[PDB]
Design an enzyme around this catalytic site. Sequence first.
Site, PDB file in Angstrom:
ATOM      1  CD  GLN A 127      -3.056   0.975   2.124  1.00 42.39           C
ATOM      2  OE1 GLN A 127      -3.080  -0.086   2.761  1.00 42.39           O
ATOM      3  NE2 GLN A 127      -3.995   1.908   2.189  1.00 42.39           N
ATOM      4  N   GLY A 136       6.695  -2.757   6.393  1.00 43.46           N
ATOM      5  CA  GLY A 136       5.647  -3.677   6.123  1.00 43.46           C
ATOM      6  C   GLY A 136       6.103  -5.057   5.795  1.00 43.46           C
ATOM      7  CD  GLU A 194      25.405  12.383 -16.107  1.00 46.27           C
ATOM      8  OE1 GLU A 194      26.207  13.223 -15.735  1.00 46.27           O
ATOM      9  OE2 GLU A 194      24.414  12.631 -16.755  1.00 46.27           O
TER      10      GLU A 194
END
Lengths: 426, 426, 428, 428
Positions: free
Chosen positions: C10, C132, C243
């Site tokens: 989520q 999570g 870069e």
Amino acid sequence: REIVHIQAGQCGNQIGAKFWEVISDEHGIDPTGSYHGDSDLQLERINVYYNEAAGNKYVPRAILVDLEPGTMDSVRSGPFGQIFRPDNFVFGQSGAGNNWAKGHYTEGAELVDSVLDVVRKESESCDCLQGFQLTHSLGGGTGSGMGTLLISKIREEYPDRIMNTFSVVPSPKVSDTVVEPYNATLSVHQLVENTDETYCIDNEALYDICFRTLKLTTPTYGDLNHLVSATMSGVTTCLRFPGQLNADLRKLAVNMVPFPRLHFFMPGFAPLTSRGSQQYRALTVPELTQQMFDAKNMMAACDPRHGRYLTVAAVFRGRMSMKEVDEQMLNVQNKNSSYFVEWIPNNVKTAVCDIPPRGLKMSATFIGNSTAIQELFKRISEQFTAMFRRKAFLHWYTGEGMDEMEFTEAESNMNDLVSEYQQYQD
Amino acid sequence: REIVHIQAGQCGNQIGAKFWEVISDEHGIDPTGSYHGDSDLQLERINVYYNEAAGNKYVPRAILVDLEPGTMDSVRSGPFGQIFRPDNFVFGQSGAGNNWAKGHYTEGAELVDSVLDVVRKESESCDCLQGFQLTHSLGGGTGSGMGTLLISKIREEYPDRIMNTFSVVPSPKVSDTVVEPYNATLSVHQLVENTDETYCIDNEALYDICFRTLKLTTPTYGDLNHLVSATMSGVTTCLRFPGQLNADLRKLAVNMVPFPRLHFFMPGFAPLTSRGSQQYRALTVPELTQQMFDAKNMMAACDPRHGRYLTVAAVFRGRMSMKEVDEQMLNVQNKNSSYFVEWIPNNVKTAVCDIPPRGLKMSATFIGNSTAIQELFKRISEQFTAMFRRKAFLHWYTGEGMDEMEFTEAESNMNDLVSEYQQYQD
Amino acid sequence: RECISIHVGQAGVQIGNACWELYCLEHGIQPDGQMPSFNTFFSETGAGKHVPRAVFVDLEPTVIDEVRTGTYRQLFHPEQLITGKEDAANNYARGHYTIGKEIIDLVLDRIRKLADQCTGLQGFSVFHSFGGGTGSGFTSLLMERLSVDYGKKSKLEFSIYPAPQVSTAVVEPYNSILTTHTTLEHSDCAFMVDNEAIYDICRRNLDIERPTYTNLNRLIGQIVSSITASLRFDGALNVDLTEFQTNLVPYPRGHFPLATYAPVISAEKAYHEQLSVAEITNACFEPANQMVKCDPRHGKYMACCLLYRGDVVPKDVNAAIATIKTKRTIQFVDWCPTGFKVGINYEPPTVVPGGDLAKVQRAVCMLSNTTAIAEAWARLDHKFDLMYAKRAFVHWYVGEGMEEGEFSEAREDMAALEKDYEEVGVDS
Amino acid sequence: RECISIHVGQAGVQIGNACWELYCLEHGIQPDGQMPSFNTFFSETGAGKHVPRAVFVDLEPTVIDEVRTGTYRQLFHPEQLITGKEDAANNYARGHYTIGKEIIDLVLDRIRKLADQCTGLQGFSVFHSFGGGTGSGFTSLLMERLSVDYGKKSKLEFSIYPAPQVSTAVVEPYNSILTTHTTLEHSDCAFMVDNEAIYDICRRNLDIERPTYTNLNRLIGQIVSSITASLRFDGALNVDLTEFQTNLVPYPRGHFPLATYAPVISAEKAYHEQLSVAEITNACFEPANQMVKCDPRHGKYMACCLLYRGDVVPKDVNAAIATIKTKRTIQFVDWCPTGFKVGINYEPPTVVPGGDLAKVQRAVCMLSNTTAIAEAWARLDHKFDLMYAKRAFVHWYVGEGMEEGEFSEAREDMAALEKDYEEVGVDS
Ligand SMILES: Nc1nc2c(ncn2[C@@H]2O[C@H](COP(=O)(O)CP(=O)(O)OP(=O)(O)O)[C@@H](O)[C@H]2O)c(=O)[nH]1
Ligand SMILES: Nc1nc2c(ncn2[C@@H]2O[C@H](COP(=O)(O)CP(=O)(O)OP(=O)(O)O)[C@@H](O)[C@H]2O)c(=O)[nH]1
Ligand SMILES: Nc1nc2c(ncn2[C@@H]2O[C@H](COP(=O)(O)OP(=O)(O)OP(=O)(O)O)[C@@H](O)[C@H]2O)c(=O)[nH]1
Ligand SMILES: Nc1nc2c(ncn2[C@@H]2O[C@H](COP(=O)(O)OP(=O)(O)OP(=O)(O)O)[C@@H](O)[C@H]2O)c(=O)[nH]1
Ligand SMILES: [Mg+2]
Ligand SMILES: [Mg+2]
Ligand SMILES: [Mg+2]
């Protein structure tokens, strides 16, 4: 002075498609066959490659042959299909399956007899044949099989005409079929006895040219076959148009073949570079000779400098001085003398004609005969032996009726050719 | 007589944008490339910087190169983008991140090979190259990295052509990146061996000029890069237009380089003052020489009077007498003899040509070679050592594959240059 | 020079929701896919519909269903909306293996599909949380497989840093530490962001009483597009992702630059204010505008990169840099002399309708490699220690097959990381 | 250059169902026979209706009735739908003789009718199982008669190989072995295919959860048309059936090439993927794409033929071959140097509406004579031994008139066959 061209197999069909496109461009012939040229010279030797049809339309003196209708149809559908007459479309309906035995030995023979009758018809329409040109693969079933059958029959009928052929040479990086070396070996065996000369072009090298020098990210056969056609048209420019030196192909054959069995050639081409740099180019003869000598601009996948030169032919198109060309090519030999064989003083021969290729002021075609070529034969013979020793897939050819000794002897002759290059090498 | 210019990095791209704008103004070339000049002389040497395209249109002999599309596009979108041909836009898609290792060593190299082919193309289109001009930064990834790679390859191909470059020099007050000294050091190391001369311009000094003398409250790069372009065009005015003395850049090189390794220059310019005072001006040669000698009108952030002069070149534009110029410049040496090195009698050399800059009656460009320059190298080397000793950020370059000794040796050569200025100093 | 966006959990998906909304806003993309105009992020179908090059994965249908019911569901291709049937219970054991392992192959093949759609993939960016399950654990699994088949492509990760304030799982330290190790093993650059610092900015510079994730995501999303969209669109000084690798990572391990962003000013406070390039960059060096809870004045700098949008002149930047060098308190490490990289686009900053920030004429993104990041790591180490000392909740991972030593190991790896930052900070 | 298709049993007929459906799809043939456009397989009536040159035989009405009730029943001529009244009970004794012998004369005369309709018959192809009754036993009977009257025409047989998994008759080994011998005696080339390997491809490359015969047949049917339709349509390098005989059979006995086919990729996985000629041929040398349950890496190669559809250039094939030679692990037997045959058509691969495979721009059929085939034979020999050791179920054949020695004999013949493959594999 006339030449009969035959396209065999997809390779032959597509390369020849580009070839005929170019030749018509050379003479101002549109896709309908109508002449809208620029010069009188365009007509003056149009007879080498064309018949004049009613209404000032021209028909290419060439036969399209295959065992698959689709290919033939795709060629006929494009520009220049219209220029060909229906009489030149000879084909069957089932490919050979990449099997020389099916193409040469069995099935292809069935069509070859009808092809030969068309050949004969065309040679009868000609005033005087100069020779024959075939375009085909060394690895395919009709390209190497059928085509070699056809060659044995044509040379039989015309012993003093020039038999030359252009053909695609297998490479480790190209190889499609496992029996491709088998087809190659068998064709080589026959070609070495039955042709006057063959050009060895390798798609690998062509791809490198396309990217490296031409800066193309996606080399396609449409462009690759374009490069081949450039060299194919180069060799008869002088034949077709006035010039100063060596127009005849036979003259070239005389100067390029020191020994009856060594008749394999390394074509190359200049100028050959992308447009990006063209604005900084300044074509001179030294510039063309630099590019033609450089192995990177060879169409054959072989670096001459690894071996030694027996002969060099350079054909120049466009208005160059005699001195410039003859001095500079002499200087090539002088500067790179270590790569030439000492038997021949003056190994470099030149041809010079007065008509440039459309779009260029000057151009040069390179034909080499160097002992380095043996490497291409090594690739084939080696791969062959690995298969042959185990007889992998052999049953597909024995199914047709080919004898193990047929292949054994074919190898033997390939080995002979390499040994002869070594004998001349040094 | 021709020059190929290359713009590398944003600096290069924007300064060069102004440069080409000015050069076209010099010759009466509009943004489309069409010539609408005033004089025959505008065309007479247009070849140094331009190709004549069909229709009396001209194309700048220069290549635009970077790793970021956006920059390139912004240049192309402005006037003068139209004058450039598509063939000169070479770029990638990911900047170097200010990393010399990415620009020089890795990524930039990939484009450099295509750039060089375009370079070669252009040098081939030229009749006779005089030299090359590059515009780039000393601190950026493509400006110092890619650009220095390109330089090593160009000098390799053209040893006797003049390699000069204009480049932006870091300052304590300017410094953007922490590794800017690292990039500078690495570029310097290479430039000192691979160029014939480089101009050292510092934005700091340029800002001071803009405010102090030009009375601008908001100095912008659009104007700062304008000042640089003035000096860049000044050095080839005589080359492009008839005059009396020293037109050739090589002649200038001969007179400005007493020792092979000391080839860093201090550009300056006169007249350089705001409009407010211009109504009270009266340009004379003494007036121009007063302004050119004065350190405040130098574009390099360095006061010559802190060191000593090895050489001085003054280029005059517009109709001035020989006496006036030669007497007055002699008098500069006479009056300020304490700032000149006694080795060279007659340290001041002059060039005088007959064509003034548009808008001025007379103008003068200053090129100095004084030992004071070492201070700029001190700023870089010092900052470098602080970073280097701790290896802060080094891992970003070691990630590319750069060796600590590569940087160590680069420093060493910077130290050599300072010591050589000191050896000549006194 | 194309890329793929991967949104996991989520946190990754909701952030992604704002990200793709922003991309729509950047190029005038309709929810239906119709757009008349970004090819780095979208491919085009023959209908003239453009499709986001992204994959959304959630082991619980819930959030994906939210996507499916939103307006941009017509933009997203159904195959890009992948869901499981049960979450990872905030637990790496399930995220990385027990559950996630059953879906990941689908996910990877959809990625391959997109990889085959791209012609010149520069790389990809992943959004997730550290704490999570799906967002951390599944993510770990994912990166293990992506580095196999892609290897060398850019692995940018945006990770949410658990705040002391917000804490939604008691085993977040454990989840985070396990994850961290794997990101060390396979990411090229990790950007961790602290919602608590962001809230502070929103309440003070945006003047928002009550920030939510929807507002927080808008801020982050814009920063991310300022890094990428801004590279794709071309400007003055374009700066590629390669870069950033080259310039921001001194040693293989120090791949954790942090982000700071300005202007972050409400419309009301922006009136009246005009910030110059220098002024915005001064805001960028203020800790108060830092999107991570740490002290930039405490740590030292190793690398810094400033990206500009809209109306910026290199000269002004040059002056700003001098100011930072002189004003500051930017202690750079000897190991890197001067390390400031500058990228300048022309593309102006964009505004979200119904947004919370003022329309601005120029905007600056600050990326930086500073030793202050160790601070955050120290906080996590401590928290781990407490939980692990008791071994509270350990059975929720062990019972799913985890090994005690695995937790010890991961912590130790973080300790090593922090020590490596110490070492680099030691001047030499 | 025409041919006849013979479908025996449900295996032959159901496969045939897809085959003729495919032929309709290849040339735009309506179920009613109307077609505006394949003359090798169809003859045309004055109505503009085209009729499939094929004979469908089933000793039990059931399957033929299915044909009769399907849409293509208007395509098929009623005389081509031949049925008995009772099956062979999975038993060669009945298939070959007791029952089948009563119908076979009808069948042969309908074949003759078609043979007389053709002007230049190249040959014919037969579809059946090894383990059935009608499909094996009847088939044997059929080939005995066809080689009498046709002789020399091409005898291609497509046989389904009983899988260990699927086994529907306990006496399948017995049925298969009896059959095998007769196919050795009268076929020119036998292609055996294992439904279990096919299922594996369908579940992994086509991603199909639950394959059925209808999906399996589609795959096979396309392969068969790639061999034949592709010869009929002309391309670049056309390869006749006679060339396959010539090139694929080194000795009279080694007539068992196996097939491998690629691309076999679902639409979803094909997005994003583009395969070159070389890449497809690399898939063709992977055991995982092999339609027969055996190991190609174990065995050696003797013959290999690659057929191409659509967008293929000889040069690319040449490169691909080099790659196979160099990459591989293609141990070719000394007896055959290099044996790779290449056929290239222009005709593009076709797609079945409601199909399960992606639309592809180029397709490759691999035929190959490898020593690995012995493996399969070994499995069957063993199974026979077990059954025959006990003599379980033997009365179901013996009671129909079979001789014990007949079974011994057939097994022994297979043992000899396997030994012959050994011998050829022995390099010399
Ligand atoms: N007088 C000027 N100096 C400039 C300008 N743009 C940049 N610079 C200076 O140049 C250095 C930074 O370089 P660039 O923009 O040229 C970097 P470049 O684009 O060459 O390479 P990358 O690392 O790939 O971005 C630095 O000293 C800037 O301060 C300009 O327009 N004028
Ligand atoms: N430079 C090119 N080489 C080609 C082309 N087409 C094929 N080839 C090469 O030729 C060989 C394969 O041959 P073909 O298409 O000519 C086979 P062919 O149609 O003559 O006979 P069949 O066996 O009956 O198909 C191989 O080395 C291919 O790689 C082409 O268009 N250009
Ligand atoms: N910025 C931002 N942070 C978020 C958002 N949603 C959640 N977070 C943070 O991310 C973490 C929450 O992760 P969860 O939502 O619990 O879990 P998940 O990572 O989606 O995966 P599961 O545990 O398996 O559900 C917390 O630290 C939240 O503060 C969001 O939309 N924006
Ligand atoms: N690929 C494929 N295999 C099939 C199909 N139908 C049956 N088979 C296989 O062929 C064998 C079944 O043969 P049966 O259907 O029992 O018998 P038959 O050969 O039709 O003849 P009878 O025994 O007399 O009915 C088994 O090995 C099946 O797995 C089909 O439609 N496709
Ligand atoms: Mg969730
Ligand atoms: Mg840049
Ligand atoms: Mg049945």
